[PDB]
Each structure stands twice: as C-alpha cells, then as structure tokens.
Symmetry: C2
Subunit: 226 residues, 2 copies
C-alpha cells in the first residue's frame, strides 16, 4: 500500500489538507495518515476540529508527505520535533509536497536550499532567506519536491500524483467520479488579476502576520546557517 501522510497542526488551514486527503483517499491501495505529536483532536484556524491518527514515533515510512499551510505555520517553523520528523521522512519519500505557506515549513527544515519553490503571494519574500530560488508559478517542481499555491493546490497536484503513482486513466477516473471541474465566479485569485483596491485590502490585512513571520524566518535561517 502507498503510504501518504499529512502534517496536522493547531491553526492549520484545514482545506489545504482536506482537499488532497479526499482525492488521494479515493485511490486503491493507499493508506492516508494525519500526523501530529500524538493522536487526538487538533483544531484548525476556523475552529473545525480534526483528529490526528498517528504520532511522529509511530508513523510508517511515507511515500508521500504533504505539509499544509495556515496561521499555525509560524509556530511550526520553530518546532524542532516537527522539523526533525519532516527531514527524516523527506529523506526517503518519493514525493515531498506542500500547499500555500506549508512551503515555509519545508524552508525552515532546510529542504528548500538551492531548490525552486513557491508559497502564498503575501509571504513570497520569505523564500529567499530560507535558501530557495523563488518562483511565481502556481505549481513548482524541483526533483521530488512539489510546492503549490492556493487553498486547493493539493486537489490539483493530487491528480498529478495519482497519474504518476498509478497511471493517467486512474487519475482521470478519480476526477470524473468526483465531477471535479471548477469554475470560479470571480477572477481575483492572484494579485495580478484582482483589482488594485482588493490587493491593497488583502495586503493590509496580512501586514501584522508578515511582520511576525519575518522575525521567525530570520531565526529559522540562523539555525540553518549553523
């Protein structure tokens, strides 16, 4: 069975995780894990309560690891237990993936050094201090690393993973079974297509978080420099 694991942490953006989870759990001969320090409840940033299924110590060797984003990323960037777990699993995983600000966690773990990567548009400046080559594209691949942007990036890249782990016909069948054919009613999903007034509002609302994450990123980079 292919072993797929998601890191589940307090203040995760749950859709970053629950999207790819439901797609990948639809495949044959896959086992999906929700990993935290111990099994039990974990609260997402919206208040939705999820349940981790395994601890770091009990998790099997993973074929795919996926790091979601969210408010909670700042704490995770300075959690030595979580960063060590991610490094251990990434050493042998066939695919190391992240959604949105989850790539900042990969960065803090040292896994973006010299690698092309993306992250959420409002935090993109934090990639270079973590050693990455920043790329402004929605899905960026570099070897076995896949980083994606957007709350639903993992739905789209889960179909790519399905095609490579199995075959294209299997990926197409899952897409059809889920009737997955998005059609957003607005075109404001990128700072390059949204109205300037909307970009300003979004930037202002993210400013305090960006300021705090600049501080965290510099400490994380100092640890990588040692």
């Amino acid at each position: 069975a292919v072993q797929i694991g998601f890191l589940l942490f307090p203040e995760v953006q749950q859709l970053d995780l629950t999207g790819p989870h439901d797609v990948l759990a639809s495949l044959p001969d896959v086992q999906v894990h929700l990993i935290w320090k111990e099994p039990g409840p974990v609260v997402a940033s919206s208040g939705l309560v999820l349940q981790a299924t395994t601890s770091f110590a009990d998790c099997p060797p993973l074929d795919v690891i996926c790091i979601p984003g969210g408010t909670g990323v700042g704490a995770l960037m300075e959690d030595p237990q979580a960063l060590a777990f991610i490094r251990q699993q990434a050493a042998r995983a066939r695919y190391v993936t992240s959604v949105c600000t989850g790539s900042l966690v990969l960065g803090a773990a040292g896994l973006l050094q010299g690698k092309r990567a993306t992250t959420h548009w409002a935090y993109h400046e934090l990639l270079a201090p973590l050693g990455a080559i920043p790329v402004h594209e929605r899905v960026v691949r570099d070897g076995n690393l896949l980083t994606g942007t957007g709350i639903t990036a993992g739905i789209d890249f889960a179909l790519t993973l399905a095609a490579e782990l199995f075959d294209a016909a299997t990926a197409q069948r899952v897409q059809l079974q889920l009737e997955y054919a998005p059609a957003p009613p607005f075109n404001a999903g990128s700072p390059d297509t949204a109205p300037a007034s909307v970009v300003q509002q979004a930037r202002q609302r993210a400013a305090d978080s960006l300021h705090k994450r600049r501080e965290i990123t510099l400490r994380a980079a100092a640890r990588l420099a040692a």
Copy 2:
C-alpha cells in the same frame, strides 16, 4: 451575525462540506454550524473524523443551509428527523443549497418539487421521480435554491453567496486571500469531456450504488405522494 449551517452525517463526502466551510468561515460576522442529531464525532466516508457542533433542537434559525453529498445520502433520504429539520430550516432560510448528491436529500424532503435542479452525473436520473426539473448544468438556481455539481461546487458557490450577502469586493478579497485559482491537470471532470473508456469504468463502479438508490428514491417518492 449571519448563521450558516452544514448537515454533517455519517459517510458524508467530507470535501463537499469542508470546502465551503473554510471559505464562508473567512467572512466577517458569520457563525458556521456543523449540525447532526447531537454534538460529537461523525465519520466521513474516507475515515476522516469530524465533530458536529450542535443538535437539531439547539440549532439557531439559519440564513444559509447547505446539504453535502456522499455515500451516506441513502440513509438520510429515509431519516424522518433529518428531513423534518431540513424542511423547517428551509422555510425561512435566505439560501437553501446542496453539493453533489446532497440534492437527493433536498428531493426526499420535498423541496425540489417543480424546481430546476442538478446532482452528480451518475445519479441524475433520480431527480425526476422526486419532482424536479432536471438540468445538466454545474450550478442551477431556482429562487432561493442553489444546487451544484462537483466535489468543490460549494467553494465556487460560496463566493457567489459572499457577494450577495456582503458585496463583490468582499468576495474578491476572500478569493485573493485564499489565492484560489484552480487549474486541473486533466479535463475528465464531466462525462462529456472524459474518454469513453473512463466513463465506462466510472459507471460500472457506481452501478450497485445506483441500483440501491433507485429503490430508496421510489420509497421517498411514495412518501411525497401521500
């Protein structure tokens, strides 16, 4: 505060729910409820464990009700307590919505009689016996009823709801904050675009479920005829 409720039932397709939940929970002055017979754990069809937050009896009057789909829809179509709750809330709700096979639950509750509606492609034949006018479109509106197809239909229609409950600029801001701009790597999300061989496989895999749901639908229709 706008009151938004999702029905959370055993064997739900969790993404049908978790997608619109995370979008709508991002809005100001909204309270989101996960409703079942009592608060506590509810297991989705993938094994993901979610937590209902309120009972039928304690739920406030809702401005928006959303019925997700999933394997578990068959039981819900013959659950008199759930159907009565849906009818009660729909009487005063500003919006009555469903994702995928959730519209079959609205049908069993009597809320599609004489109304244009859609559902998952493999189950579309079950709409007419429930009194609906079947429509092969991804989002179908009829008055205050919105029915959508695809596991992520609620993400897209949640942006429409945001624009009508608030304004277009608010919907655009949420879209940008979430960096929501999907780009599926395959084009097999409809039986009209998928390869014929893939459509056959998907139809064969759904056949036992369709057969059981034909039987349930006829019993549900008999209750509406009384």
